[PDB]
Symmetry: C2
Subunit: 228 residues, 2 copies
């Protein structure tokens, strides 16, 4: 665990309080870098980062079949639902899964708190840490979650925000109101670089841009994003 | 079939002889646009565009397991092999599959000529047309090829050359020596736009850039690529 006092700079440059864990797996030897080890180990409601395991649950439970399936009531497929902030599709999924399957699903994947007591992933008691996001993400990357490999591939395809010839960025934001996240990874020919940042958002919507901004400055600093 | 005399301009702007089929599925009604219907229906050796069905064959036949599997003799995974021009990995796959499984695989997917008589996809008798590329690509997109859905997803993930928030470009070039291709699609929230261009390459390596260049000018002309 490499304690990154060299990365505080990116946080304070934007007046931000947060933590980040990056796991750089591009060399034969893997490092684990951390800013605020303590906050990194703290557990926070995932919010919309939960869309990643939640889609695996919905797919497993056949709450949704396909990338092609349309939900009406403006029509969402699984890709628009992943990419947007409209809440009803995932709320639908939760109702169709129920608290018990969710419960068991959460223990199966060992997702933080594992406890789903409105929406359980923002308004309930479910909580995960930056380190726990990293461990989960890496399992999904290696296709080792207890889900069909096709569902894992699908979800990983839904998470694409950006790509070039050599690299694929697969990532998800979340915001609880008091704090927000950005998690995901970027793949390079030699391997991935996982990231999971949370920060506090005292200035609310005006702080949201700092999620990706801070993480991106850090990733450019270790050559894990292209120049601009 | 909408005959695109409005697209000749992009071909001659680069002194090029070729055809293109685009299938725009972004509206409830699908169109099929074509430049040179006749050459569009003609069959040409796929060359490296064959890497797309060939990877499905290798995966099915467990010639390769995984995105993670490494081939030695510089080490290739399935992603580097897809992205590069180094020939030995796919030649390996062919030997492990043999002419008979290849044969049956080709008939199963109804891939052009269906006949694998060095490398059969550049030096043999296998041949497919721009229209036949389009039909195959659309099957892969809908997950309706006779292969596990996970293998289809994988191959579709290997084909990513580029992406943004809203769009994913999944594409493959080929060159035979006398002619070259670019095929693939780009996905938008409302649906994909399939493309398959071949052109002659009398000036050899100096003509190769025209494959993507012509197709891209066309796709920008119908708003199916971002501005630049």
């Amino acid at each position: 665990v490499v304690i990154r006092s060299d990365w505080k700079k990116f946080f304070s440059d934007l007046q931000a309080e947060g933590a980040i864990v990056i796991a750089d797996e591009r060399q034969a030897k893997h490092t684990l870098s951390v800013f605020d080890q303590e906050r990194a180990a703290k557990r926070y409601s995932p919010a919309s980062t939960f869309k990643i395991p939640h889609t695996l649950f919905a797919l497993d439970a056949d709450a949704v079949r396909d990338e092609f399936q349309v939900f009406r009531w403006q029509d969402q497929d699984l890709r628009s639902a992943m990419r947007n902030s409209t809440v009803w599709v995932y709320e639908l999924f939760a109702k169709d899964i129920g608290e018990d399957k969710a419960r068991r699903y959460l223990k199966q994947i060992d997702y933080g708190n594992v406890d789903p007591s409105g929406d359980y992933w923002i308004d309930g008691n479910l909580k995960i840490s930056a380190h726990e996001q990293i461990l989960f993400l890496r399992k999904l990357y290696r296709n080792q979650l207890p889900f069909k490999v096709e569902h894992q591939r699908l979800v990983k395809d839904l998470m694409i925000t950006e790509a070039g010839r050599s690299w694929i960025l697969r990532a998800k934001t979340g915001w609880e109101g008091r704090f927000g996240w950005w998690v995901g990874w970027i793949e390079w020919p030699t391997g991935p670089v996982f990231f999971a940042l949370n920060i506090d958002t005292p200035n609310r919507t005006d702080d949201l841009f700092k999620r990706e901004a801070i993480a991106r400055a850090i990733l450019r600093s270790i050559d894990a994003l292209p120049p601009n």
